[PDB]
């Protein structure tokens, strides 16, 4: 609420966001959830800032560094490309760098990862990344959505969560496939409520 | 200093927003206060009062859902301004949010 926070949101624009769950496209459902999340964060505290990057496509792309201007955030999400596979480690490191350079250093630091596709990393690689976030005072929220048939994916995401978690400041939200709307499942969770 | 890929009218950013359904704004903490979702046809607001988006946009383009100006006050009348004309009456808004119906293709 009165919390002051800079957040970087990492969007999954991989090839897995093209096929399957129609109405809406999985990328569009994701974009709408980010829209609502940025509205919640900017209304919670007018000094909060939110930035956006995409993890897949032709390579990790920073659409905006964190800003308090909802219009800049929403405009930057127009015309997203789809393809490839997520580069999770590079995305998290670029996101961490953007948060390190936040103008208001009094802001807490948080990364939100939308994980809607396979996690092609081993736990060991994910735990190094997680411990480094923790060392740098960065909290993590993970949204695990999409296909629910790869049983190592939640275990890999749980290992990343456990490496970063400090004072239960980090969270995972499992969105069961065949869901209502990505945003509806997220609304009552710590990703929105803090 | 606006970049070549940003659209501004003076201080006002033009912000195109695609929605799968206008109803997803019902829980949007920024925009929920300004929409009356019982209304038919795209509307714009004359100020930022509660449920202000009531003024009918003239001859609206296909898939236009609404226009929200985040600040200022302007002439608010029905069936007078087409979308392109609305861009000149920001009157101090920092953002013009233009909401569009998403099409799955």
From Swiss-Prot, chain A:
Protein name according to UniProt: 26S proteasome non-ATPase regulatory subunit 4 homolog
Domain of life: Eukaryota
Keywords from the UniProt entry: Phosphoprotein, Proteasome, Repeat
Tissue expression as described in the entry: Ubiquitous with highest expression in flowers.
Domain VWFA intervals: 6-191
Any one GO molecular-function label of the UniProt entry: peptide receptor activity
Gene Ontology cellular-component terms listed: nucleus; plasma membrane; proteasome complex
Annotated knockout phenotype: Displays reduced seed germination, growth rate, stamen number, genetic transmission through the male gamete, hormone-induced cell division and increased oxidative stress tolerance. Is also more sensitive to abscisic acid (ABA), salt, sucrose stress, heat shock and DNA-damaging agents and shows a decreased sensitivity to cytokinin and auxin. In flowers, epidermal cells in petals were larger than those in the wild type.
Assembly and interaction partners: Component of the 19S regulatory particle (RP/PA700) base subcomplex of the 26S proteasome. The 26S proteasome is composed of a core protease (CP), known as the 20S proteasome, capped at one or both ends by the 19S regulatory particle (RP/PA700). The RP/PA700 complex is composed of at least 17 different subunits in two subcomplexes, the base and the lid, which form the portions proximal and distal to the 20S proteolytic core, respectively. Interacts with PI4KG4. Interacts with RAD23s and DSK2s via its UIM3 and UIM1 motif, respectively.
Protein's job: Plays a role in maintaining the structural integrity of the 19S regulatory particle (RP), subcomplex of the 26S proteasome. Plays a major role in both the direct and indirect recognition of ubiquitinated substrates of ubiquitin/26S proteasome-mediated proteolysis (UPP). Binds and presumably selects ubiquitin-conjugates for destruction. Prefers multiubiquitin chains rather than single ubiquitins, with a binding affinity for 'Lys-48'-linked ubiquitin chains. Acts as a potential docking subunit for both ubiquitin receptors RAD23s and DSK2s.
Signal peptide: none
């Amino acid at each position: 609420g009165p919390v002051l926070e800079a957040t970087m949101i990492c969007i999954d624009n991989s090839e897995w966001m093209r096929n399957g769950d129609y109405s809406p496209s999985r990328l569009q459902a994701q974009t709408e959830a980010v829209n609502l999340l940025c509205g919640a964060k900017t209304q919670s505290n007018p000094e909060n800032t939110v930035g956006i990057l995409t993890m897949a496509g032709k390579g990790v792309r920073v659409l905006t560094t964190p800003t308090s201007d909802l219009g800049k955030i929403l405009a930057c999400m127009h015309g997203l490309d789809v393809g490839g596979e997520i580069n999770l480690t590079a995305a998290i490191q670029i996101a961490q760098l953007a948060l390190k350079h936040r103008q208001n250093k009094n802001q807490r630091q948080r990364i939100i990862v939308f994980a809607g596709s396979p996690i092609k990393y081993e736990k060991k690689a994910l735990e190094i990344v997680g411990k480094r976030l923790k060392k740098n005072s960065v909290s993590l929220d993970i949204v695990n959505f999409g296909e629910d048939d790869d049983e190592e994916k939640p275990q890999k995401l749980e290992a990343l969560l456990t490496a970063v978690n400090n004072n239960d400041g980090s969270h995972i939200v499992h969105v069961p496939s065949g869901a209502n709307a990505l945003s509806d499942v997220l609304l009552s969770t710590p990703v929105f409520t803090g | 200093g606006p970049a070549p890929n940003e659209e501004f009218v003076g201080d006002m950013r033009i912000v195109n927003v695609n929605l799968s359904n206008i109803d997803i704004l019902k829980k949007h903490e920024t925009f929920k206060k300004y929409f009356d979702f019982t209304l038919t046809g795209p509307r714009y607001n004359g100020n930022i009062a509660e449920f202000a988006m009531i003024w009918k946009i003239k001859n609206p383009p296909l898939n236009l859902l609404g226009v929200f100006f985040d600040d200022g006050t302007r002439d608010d009348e029905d069936d007078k301004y087409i979308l392109e004309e609305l861009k000149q009456i920001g009157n101090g808004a920092k953002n013009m949010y233009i909401f569009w119906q998403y099409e799955q293709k």
